[PDB]
Amino acid sequence: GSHMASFNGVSEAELLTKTLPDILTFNLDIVIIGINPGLMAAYKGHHYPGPGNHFWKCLFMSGLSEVQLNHMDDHTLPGKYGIGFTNMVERTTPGSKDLSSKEFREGGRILVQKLQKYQPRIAVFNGKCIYEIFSKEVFGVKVKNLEFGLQPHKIPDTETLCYVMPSSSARCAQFPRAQDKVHYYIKLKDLRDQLKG
DNA sequence: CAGCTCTGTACGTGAGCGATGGACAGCT
DNA sequence: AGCTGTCCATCGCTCAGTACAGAGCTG
């Protein structure tokens, strides 16, 4: 059975009109770029609340957070950990498959402007799909075998690096557990520690 | 032919839903 | 002992991007 009970009598139609505000400041070490808000994120008004989403679990397992945090802690992340949040696409949908190419490319244009303003040390793409679109649109680059981790391009007119991880969503069968994704959060922590020294 | 894009489909975990029914206490 | 209702453990089930085959282009 489905988990519509977790929406506590709020309809899907109402959730589809909701947005998730960005959590951005200057001098951030990391900005997590999600695809777009999912239904639970639009419902809560906080990043990655999906009970199954691996984000908060991987941030703890990797040592990026010293305690197990949850979505309610997302506003504390810039000050305490140097981490911020944004999304490629603003619109709420149940899945990444409901977004058109035009929406992603409009998202990309808005995103590169936000990155050129805030200039985090590292732009982290939480999903391979959004970086494939970003790269083609911003760097004019399309490689046959896009890989995860550090990308060879910096955000134009900045020193901000691009780093790609598999989506924290548990919809992804290729990295079925938070354990299968934690390697990338550890390498992100190692890349951050290296930049800060 | 060869290589490219585009679209459709298949794919593992683990959390949490409603349904079910066993255990058990209250009350005759 | 017999009846009945609640609670809660448990089960069956749902569901939150990515890789890749193969059709359709095009050089």
Residue numbers in the entry: 105 to 301
What does the paper say about this structure?
Thymine DNA glycosylase (TDG) is a base excision repair (BER) enzyme that acts on derivatives of 5-methylcytosine (mC) arising from deamination or oxidation. TDG excises thymine from G·T mispairs, an activity that is needed to protect against C→T transition mutations caused by deamination of mC to T. It also plays an essential role in active DNA demethylation, which likely accounts for findings that its depletion in mice causes embryonic lethality. One established pathway for active DNA demethylation involves TDG excision of 5-formylcytosine or 5-carboxylcytosine, oxidation derivatives of mC generated by TET (ten–eleven translocation) enzymes. To address this problem, we developed improved crystallization conditions for TDG and solved high-resolution (up to 1.45 Å) structures of product complexes generated from substrates including G·hmU, G·T, G·U, G·fC and G·caC.
To rule out the possibility that acetate displaces the excised base in the product complex, we grew crystals of a TDGcat product complex, generated from a G·U substrate, using mother liquor that did not contain acetate and solved a structure at 1.75 Å resolution. The electron density demonstrates that the active site does not contain acetate or the excised uracil base. Rather, it contains only water molecules and the abasic sugar. Moreover, crystals grown under acetate-free conditions yield structures of the E·P complex that contain only water molecules in the active site. Interestingly, our new structures indicate that absence of the excised base (or acetate) in the active site impacts the equilibrium between the two potential anomeric forms of the abasic sugar produced by TDG. However, for those crystallized under acetate-free conditions, the abasic sugar exists in a roughly equal mix of α and β anomers, each forming different interactions involving C1’-OH. The β anomer contacts several ordered water molecules in the active-site, while the α anomer contacts the Oδ of Asn140, the side chain that coordinates the putative water nucleophile in the E·S complex. Our findings show that dissociation of the excised base is required for TDG binding to the β anomer of the abasic sugar.
